[PDB]
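Q: I'm writing a short explainer about General vesicular transport factor p115 for a general audience and would like to include a description of its predicted shape. Could you first generate the structure from this sequence?
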Amino acid sequence: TEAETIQKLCDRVASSTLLDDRRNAVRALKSLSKKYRLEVGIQAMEHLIHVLQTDRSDSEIIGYALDTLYNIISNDDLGSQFTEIFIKQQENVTLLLSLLEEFDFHVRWPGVKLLTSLLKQLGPQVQQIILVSPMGVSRLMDLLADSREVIRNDGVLLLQALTRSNGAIQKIVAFENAFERLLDIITEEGNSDGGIVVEDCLILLQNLLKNNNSNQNFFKEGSYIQRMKPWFEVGDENSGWSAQKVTNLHLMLQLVRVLVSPNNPPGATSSCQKAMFQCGLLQQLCTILMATGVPADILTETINTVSEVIRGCQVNQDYFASVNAPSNPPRPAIVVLLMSMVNERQPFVLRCAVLYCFQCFLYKNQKGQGEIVSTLLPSTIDATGNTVSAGQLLCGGLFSTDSLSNWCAAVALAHALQENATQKEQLLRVQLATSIGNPPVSLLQQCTNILSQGSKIQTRVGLLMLLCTWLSNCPIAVTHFLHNSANVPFLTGQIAENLGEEEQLVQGLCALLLGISIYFNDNSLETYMKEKLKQLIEKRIGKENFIEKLGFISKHELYSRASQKPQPNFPSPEYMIFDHEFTKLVKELEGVITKAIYKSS
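A: Of course. Here's the predicted structure. Afterward I'll give you a sentence or two in plain language.
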């Protein structure tokens, strides 16, 4: 029986009076830790611990005790329960911290590996023991300063486990110089060309910053954002990028994004956007955005990063508009964006990213909005220099046969109009170039006409989000809409029908559009005053029925997700239904429209 033989090694370790004997026993008990743990765990563990408490004068036996404990605890779920047994006595963890003050390799290295495993398996509990132990975090931070690369590198992994989801420890590590030290490890290792140690440092940096407002502030106020610029100085290569270089650069971009996340306190993102402009980071990122031979996944992530760097920041938005591609007719980055978005051939995730970048370029940027719309107006301002305009590309996508391009172009245009009173009115002057035989038709009416043409649902959702955005807060748009006599009957007909579930969303959007045409109706068009439209709802469809159908939009499965996330990074083309900003409009208007409809007078 092994339970007995290991009991004899246990009693030797415990009772044996000479160091040499105890040591050979621990060494053998080690043999039985790998390939045989369970008894060793339940019968050797407290003796191995006793060797750590006594016997500290012999590095060799301590080494073996820790290697054996590592083997009891680590999984390369037995590992979980042995961890719980180990830490029952919290002094067992503080004893490990004491041992980590020793520099002898055979003590230090296994100590680091064991405490890392404990930390990975029972994070919150082990972290708490370390946090309240005097000098506990300090002794671990100092592992980064060990002369031996193997220890320093395993120290980074330990500190990932220590900092994970622990605000208090993250703040201590920041005060103890972690940002400078980790950035310097990355520089020395060669930035994104630096292999797995760089990846590990970047992961630790993410633990230090993600969901940590105080550390993001420390990062910014410590003038560390400028240290991120060299990371994106990639140019000598641009064909044979290793998988590890891609992994590193992806993490580096994610770090940039943490600092300008739309979910931060607004002042934090804004102040970081400014700092990124001042040290040349934004400019450097736009350089990779316009380079050649950048792997698809980096290109997409870089576009999504630049998006958040510019989002709502006038100086940065204006910088982005000044960026040109290196072509014989210089071509704005914005045009290069829109080309890709409506390119039926490009990868879906790239088309989504380019849409995000365009939305963020326009966000709170009335100047940019007016620049886009003005390319659609009969105004011979020298558009040449770049012959294809942003407006021409959006019209092409709007009326192309590809529903994805229809949706993206309609949403891109809605973002050009949103909260812009002037551009909503300007866009009403746009008349489509019609092909031979066809009568003239306004852009507004043509968008509307497409809704009754057997177009795909996706096409019609996009056009309806556009039309709702256009008419919202714009009585003159409402009048131009209502003045074409086909529009109200069409809307009431669509809403009144008893169609399948997928078609219900279109019905709901039709109800929103009809509601907008009541709520924002200035009663200047005798044919369709508010009371006439309301009586029409009652007769053709019924007031309660109207509201049920209006309610379909916000009750849709994908609506909740679109409302929470600004990024349009849908899983696949069939999920491309709702725009985030559009969800804000529905939230703003559904309630007040509902009240307007139920009102009697």
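A: For your explainer, you could say: The chain has one domain: 1-601.
Q: Perfect, that's easy to follow.
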